[PDB]
Amino acid sequence: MANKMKTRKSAKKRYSFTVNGKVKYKKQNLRHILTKKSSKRKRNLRKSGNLSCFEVKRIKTLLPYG
Amino acid sequence: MKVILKEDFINLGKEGDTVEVRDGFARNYLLPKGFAVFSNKHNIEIFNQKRRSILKKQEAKKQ
Amino acid sequence: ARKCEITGKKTMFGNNVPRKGLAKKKGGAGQHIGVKTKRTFKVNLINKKFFIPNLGRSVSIKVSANALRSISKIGLDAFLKKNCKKIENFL
RNA sequence: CGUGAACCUUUACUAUAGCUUGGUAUUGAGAUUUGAUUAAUUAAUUAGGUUUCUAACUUAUAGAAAUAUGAGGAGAGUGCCAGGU
RNA sequence: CUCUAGUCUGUUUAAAAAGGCAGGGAUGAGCUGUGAAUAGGAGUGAAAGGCUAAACAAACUCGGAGAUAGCUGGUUCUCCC
RNA sequence: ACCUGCGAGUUAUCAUGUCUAGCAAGAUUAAAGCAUAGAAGUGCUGGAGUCGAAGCGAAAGCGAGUCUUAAAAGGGCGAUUU
RNA sequence: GUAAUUUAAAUGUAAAUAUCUUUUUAAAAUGUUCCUGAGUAGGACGAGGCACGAGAAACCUUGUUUGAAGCUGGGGAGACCA
RNA sequence: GGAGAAGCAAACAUUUAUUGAUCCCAAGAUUACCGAAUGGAGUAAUCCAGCUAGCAAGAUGCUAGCUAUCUAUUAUUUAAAUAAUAGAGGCGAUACCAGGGGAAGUGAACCAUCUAAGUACCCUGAGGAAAAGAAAUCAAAGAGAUUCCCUUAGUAGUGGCGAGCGAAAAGGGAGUAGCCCAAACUUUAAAUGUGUCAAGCUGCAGAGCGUUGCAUUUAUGGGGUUGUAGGACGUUUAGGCUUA
């Protein structure tokens, strides 16, 4: 209790964990200038995605409890 | 500062009256010179009772 | 010291905090604190003279404008009594 | 060479001593017209402008102090807030 | 009695700044004994980034302090895949 | 310079993986108390709490479904085979 | 010396008992008046502490100013209003 | 406590100890000078005094006993001035606690916000613990003073939303304890002000016109301490009497 590993809050506020490992996240580029972006591009950016399996280990280090 | 006049003044009131005056006026002039006294219990009440019983009226000022 | 001889008020140490930007309650995106420095807030003592008819003489005391206001409100003897000080400690 | 260290300079950036301006407390009483606002030139407030008397306050002398006398003055000084440098 | 241009010795020297020869001042902006005053982002400086206990482009001691280094160095017995 | 001594991945906690031991849809007590002993023990007492057992959705909320949507119409994340 | 026992004239530290000291030498019981903490509560500006950096920023302390009610009351319930 | 002792180690020659030594413990005496050092002064371990007593006291003689300062309380016109007692000065703990002052090296691979951090350190206070402590509280649960643990929990939030910082309530424990003033009224007065009438008193009567008349302050006793109860008024009361 003297040294509980601290979670990385800025990472907690962006990453989420699925039940068997994958990491859910919100896609970028749908926050700002949007008139020029095509409608199908924007529609795909709206729907949430899953990260590549290459970041999952680092993310599991960043979120020691969540 | 509410003050009770030990005498009469041109714009303030009569001996025995209580008036609101600016604090500098009260503290630097009236209180030290004796023209008036602080409107406290044990002073205001004593002065009012004495004025109403022993004095009981204007000393020829009204006439 | 810069100490009210009646109440005991003394100077208070704090910061000096500059701010850049526009507050959100004025439409701005916010404010940012700059480099804080150290500073002091000073009591404004007044070397006042109170004429006491009770011994027909004037006594000079270091009081703050706040204590002057309170004396004007309550009376010097009562105020000294409330702060457990006596006029003879002055002079 | 190291997103090294220190010093110095500047019309580099950001603070700040100090200086300066305004408001307010300290800070009262007068006289006068410059107005604004509110209603009906009048009346109720309020910022000022030009002036006055000293009791606040502070300069000179005597005194340990108290106190007194002679001059300034509700100014200045000192806090707090704000504007410049 | 106080100073050091020029030259030489010395430079693992006798001396962590001298000595051997010489030169300047030498009644004055003079030398010096004995006390005292000015302490570190400060003092002092007839002004050279000088001095302030043999070291000063910010003295020394203690503490923070085991400061931080993408830099350098070091990291100890054995065998098999 | 030689030689001889001294001279560097440790400890405390959290996360996670593996091994070992035990129980099992459950597992486990922390602080602390009592008893004996004087023997900084170890046998009990103590379940407050934590991790599994249901997830999805920003959330409300709904649930082996949920969200995106008029739509299980197609997918995203689940599961019925722990 | 160790186990289990055990020396206190005097001194120091502890309780308990009286002495001593002090207090009640009374309480259950209805409505009218008095008081119930004043430059204080609060507000404006400038700061600090609350985990909380002005952020919607409560609340508390607090410097400069201003300023209350008096149980027919006031404070608090994370802006504020009921 | 009993046979050695003359320190910490013996030596060399001198005594003591069974007349109870040495030594240990308790108490008392002695206790130079400096040092908070305090009669003044001073280069700390020392010169210079004032007064009193004794040395033939005496010509810079010696010894003993007093004269420092601050604060509180009064002996007075507590300021001035002495007098009276009472409590403090400094050291110790390179520990702990409270109050005040408050960085910088770092991290953010810079830095200016932030972090480090109320950290180091400085200063003022006492204690054996301190601080705090009996709700104008927590907080939407029905609890009930303060403090210290286990959990809640790395949670809720905050943060150039960058790095980081980081609760509280509830629950489970250690340990337990609640109280007292001011004010509301009244008594005893004093001091300071003001006052010559219906001002005091539970209410009929007589006396009575100032029981100091009414207030404030100081001092004493009764009265009382809270989801608004305590006093003046409402009764049974009020052990019982003496005083009013």
mmCIF file of N, CA, C and O (backbone and C1' of nucleotides) in Angstrom, chain H residues 126-146:
data_model
loop_
_atom_site.group_PDB
_atom_site.id
_atom_site.type_symbol
_atom_site.label_atom_id
_atom_site.label_comp_id
_atom_site.label_asym_id
_atom_site.label_seq_id
_atom_site.Cartn_x
_atom_site.Cartn_y
_atom_site.Cartn_z
ATOM 1 P P A H 126 7.632 29.262 26.821
ATOM 2 O "O5'" A H 126 7.083 28.345 28.003
ATOM 3 C "C5'" A H 126 7.403 26.964 28.065
ATOM 4 C "C4'" A H 126 6.253 26.106 27.598
ATOM 5 C "C3'" A H 126 6.318 24.640 27.989
ATOM 6 O "O3'" A H 126 5.876 24.403 29.313
ATOM 7 C "C1'" A H 126 5.793 24.815 25.695
ATOM 8 P P G H 127 6.528 23.224 30.187
ATOM 9 O "O5'" G H 127 5.800 21.910 29.658
ATOM 10 C "C5'" G H 127 4.385 21.798 29.690
ATOM 11 C "C4'" G H 127 3.908 20.617 28.886
ATOM 12 C "C3'" G H 127 4.547 19.280 29.229
ATOM 13 O "O3'" G H 127 3.957 18.666 30.362
ATOM 14 C "C1'" G H 127 4.554 19.576 26.884
ATOM 15 P P G H 128 4.867 17.871 31.421
ATOM 16 O "O5'" G H 128 4.787 16.358 30.935
ATOM 17 C "C5'" G H 128 3.530 15.757 30.638
ATOM 18 C "C4'" G H 128 3.632 14.779 29.493
ATOM 19 C "C3'" G H 128 4.144 13.388 29.861
ATOM 20 O "O3'" G H 128 3.546 12.421 28.997
ATOM 21 C "C1'" G H 128 5.599 14.366 28.286
ATOM 22 P P A H 129 2.089 11.811 29.310
ATOM 23 O "O5'" A H 129 1.416 11.675 27.871
ATOM 24 C "C5'" A H 129 0.838 12.799 27.221
ATOM 25 C "C4'" A H 129 1.895 13.688 26.611
ATOM 26 C "C3'" A H 129 1.400 14.929 25.887
ATOM 27 O "O3'" A H 129 1.084 15.991 26.771
ATOM 28 C "C1'" A H 129 3.039 13.843 24.572
ATOM 29 P P A H 130 -0.259 16.850 26.561
ATOM 30 O "O5'" A H 130 0.070 17.785 25.317
ATOM 31 C "C5'" A H 130 1.124 18.736 25.373
ATOM 32 C "C4'" A H 130 1.567 19.150 23.991
ATOM 33 C "C3'" A H 130 0.477 19.712 23.091
ATOM 34 O "O3'" A H 130 0.230 21.088 23.325
ATOM 35 C "C1'" A H 130 1.695 18.068 21.912
ATOM 36 P P A H 131 -1.277 21.625 23.484
ATOM 37 O "O5'" A H 131 -1.833 21.654 21.992
ATOM 38 C "C5'" A H 131 -1.201 22.436 20.990
ATOM 39 C "C4'" A H 131 -1.540 21.942 19.606
ATOM 40 C "C3'" A H 131 -3.023 21.840 19.285
ATOM 41 O "O3'" A H 131 -3.589 23.079 18.897
ATOM 42 C "C1'" A H 131 -1.946 19.839 18.647
ATOM 43 P P A H 132 -4.912 23.630 19.626
ATOM 44 O "O5'" A H 132 -6.061 22.641 19.140
ATOM 45 C "C5'" A H 132 -6.383 22.516 17.763
ATOM 46 C "C4'" A H 132 -7.109 21.225 17.481
ATOM 47 C "C3'" A H 132 -8.362 20.974 18.308
ATOM 48 O "O3'" A H 132 -9.502 21.643 17.797
ATOM 49 C "C1'" A H 132 -7.012 19.038 18.322
ATOM 50 P P G H 133 -10.501 22.416 18.791
ATOM 51 O "O5'" G H 133 -11.324 21.248 19.496
ATOM 52 C "C5'" G H 133 -12.109 20.343 18.732
ATOM 53 C "C4'" G H 133 -12.393 19.079 19.502
ATOM 54 C "C3'" G H 133 -13.069 19.261 20.852
ATOM 55 O "O3'" G H 133 -14.472 19.425 20.750
ATOM 56 C "C1'" G H 133 -11.229 17.804 21.092
ATOM 57 P P A H 134 -15.169 20.782 21.251
ATOM 58 O "O5'" A H 134 -16.667 20.347 21.570
ATOM 59 C "C5'" A H 134 -17.475 19.726 20.575
ATOM 60 C "C4'" A H 134 -18.495 18.790 21.181
ATOM 61 C "C3'" A H 134 -19.339 19.383 22.310
ATOM 62 O "O3'" A H 134 -20.659 18.841 22.255
ATOM 63 C "C1'" A H 134 -18.156 17.496 23.110
ATOM 64 P P A H 135 -21.829 19.645 21.498
ATOM 65 O "O5'" A H 135 -21.192 19.989 20.080
ATOM 66 C "C5'" A H 135 -21.894 20.775 19.124
ATOM 67 C "C4'" A H 135 -21.089 20.947 17.860
ATOM 68 C "C3'" A H 135 -21.733 21.821 16.787
ATOM 69 O "O3'" A H 135 -20.711 22.507 16.065
ATOM 70 C "C1'" A H 135 -21.392 19.645 15.931
ATOM 71 P P A H 136 -20.313 24.014 16.456
ATOM 72 O "O5'" A H 136 -21.464 24.895 15.797
ATOM 73 C "C5'" A H 136 -21.700 24.857 14.398
ATOM 74 C "C4'" A H 136 -23.168 24.988 14.085
ATOM 75 C "C3'" A H 136 -23.538 25.001 12.611
ATOM 76 O "O3'" A H 136 -23.604 23.700 12.051
ATOM 77 C "C1'" A H 136 -24.656 26.764 13.722
ATOM 78 P P U H 137 -23.067 23.430 10.560
ATOM 79 O "O5'" U H 137 -22.178 22.115 10.702
ATOM 80 C "C5'" U H 137 -20.920 22.155 11.359
ATOM 81 C "C4'" U H 137 -20.328 20.776 11.514
ATOM 82 C "C3'" U H 137 -20.334 19.902 10.270
ATOM 83 O "O3'" U H 137 -19.274 20.199 9.378
ATOM 84 C "C1'" U H 137 -21.113 18.650 12.116
ATOM 85 P P C H 138 -19.336 19.697 7.853
ATOM 86 O "O5'" C H 138 -18.873 18.173 7.929
ATOM 87 C "C5'" C H 138 -19.162 17.267 6.875
ATOM 88 C "C4'" C H 138 -19.329 15.861 7.391
ATOM 89 C "C3'" C H 138 -19.999 14.878 6.443
ATOM 90 O "O3'" C H 138 -19.105 14.336 5.486
ATOM 91 C "C1'" C H 138 -20.973 14.696 8.593
ATOM 92 P P A H 139 -19.253 14.702 3.926
ATOM 93 O "O5'" A H 139 -20.692 14.151 3.528
ATOM 94 C "C5'" A H 139 -21.020 12.776 3.672
ATOM 95 C "C4'" A H 139 -22.487 12.592 3.961
ATOM 96 C "C3'" A H 139 -23.437 12.951 2.826
ATOM 97 O "O3'" A H 139 -23.594 11.890 1.897
ATOM 98 C "C1'" A H 139 -24.177 13.973 4.827
ATOM 99 P P A H 140 -24.501 12.080 0.583
ATOM 100 O "O5'" A H 140 -25.946 11.582 1.031
ATOM 101 C "C5'" A H 140 -26.159 10.250 1.495
ATOM 102 C "C4'" A H 140 -27.628 9.952 1.680
ATOM 103 C "C3'" A H 140 -28.446 9.919 0.391
ATOM 104 O "O3'" A H 140 -29.514 8.953 0.437
ATOM 105 C "C1'" A H 140 -29.256 11.644 1.797
ATOM 106 P P A H 141 -29.880 8.061 1.735
ATOM 107 O "O5'" A H 141 -28.590 7.169 2.016
ATOM 108 C "C5'" A H 141 -28.714 5.877 2.595
ATOM 109 C "C4'" A H 141 -27.957 5.767 3.896
ATOM 110 C "C3'" A H 141 -28.801 5.723 5.161
ATOM 111 O "O3'" A H 141 -29.347 4.441 5.424
ATOM 112 C "C1'" A H 141 -27.019 7.249 5.455
ATOM 113 P P G H 142 -30.776 4.304 6.145
ATOM 114 O "O5'" G H 142 -30.769 5.460 7.242
ATOM 115 C "C5'" G H 142 -31.013 5.173 8.615
ATOM 116 C "C4'" G H 142 -29.832 5.538 9.479
ATOM 117 C "C3'" G H 142 -30.074 5.457 10.986
ATOM 118 O "O3'" G H 142 -28.874 5.043 11.639
ATOM 119 C "C1'" G H 142 -29.451 7.659 10.407
ATOM 120 P P A H 143 -28.939 4.383 13.104
ATOM 121 O "O5'" A H 143 -28.827 5.630 14.088
ATOM 122 C "C5'" A H 143 -27.637 5.889 14.821
ATOM 123 C "C4'" A H 143 -26.544 6.439 13.942
ATOM 124 C "C3'" A H 143 -25.444 7.215 14.649
ATOM 125 O "O3'" A H 143 -24.470 6.376 15.247
ATOM 126 C "C1'" A H 143 -26.153 8.413 12.739
ATOM 127 P P G H 144 -24.119 6.525 16.808
ATOM 128 O "O5'" G H 144 -23.548 8.006 16.939
ATOM 129 C "C5'" G H 144 -22.388 8.413 16.219
ATOM 130 C "C4'" G H 144 -22.159 9.901 16.321
ATOM 131 C "C3'" G H 144 -21.783 10.414 17.709
ATOM 132 O "O3'" G H 144 -20.906 11.532 17.575
ATOM 133 C "C1'" G H 144 -23.793 11.438 17.010
ATOM 134 P P A H 145 -19.320 11.344 17.754
ATOM 135 O "O5'" A H 145 -18.919 12.457 18.820
ATOM 136 C "C5'" A H 145 -19.230 13.824 18.596
ATOM 137 C "C4'" A H 145 -18.159 14.732 19.145
ATOM 138 C "C3'" A H 145 -16.767 14.550 18.561
ATOM 139 O "O3'" A H 145 -16.599 15.208 17.316
ATOM 140 C "C1'" A H 145 -16.621 14.636 20.915
ATOM 141 P P U H 146 -15.764 14.508 16.135
ATOM 142 O "O5'" U H 146 -14.246 14.666 16.590
ATOM 143 C "C5'" U H 146 -13.672 15.950 16.782
ATOM 144 C "C4'" U H 146 -12.377 15.869 17.549
ATOM 145 C "C3'" U H 146 -11.305 14.970 16.954
ATOM 146 O "O3'" U H 146 -10.577 15.595 15.912
ATOM 147 C "C1'" U H 146 -11.517 14.521 19.265
#
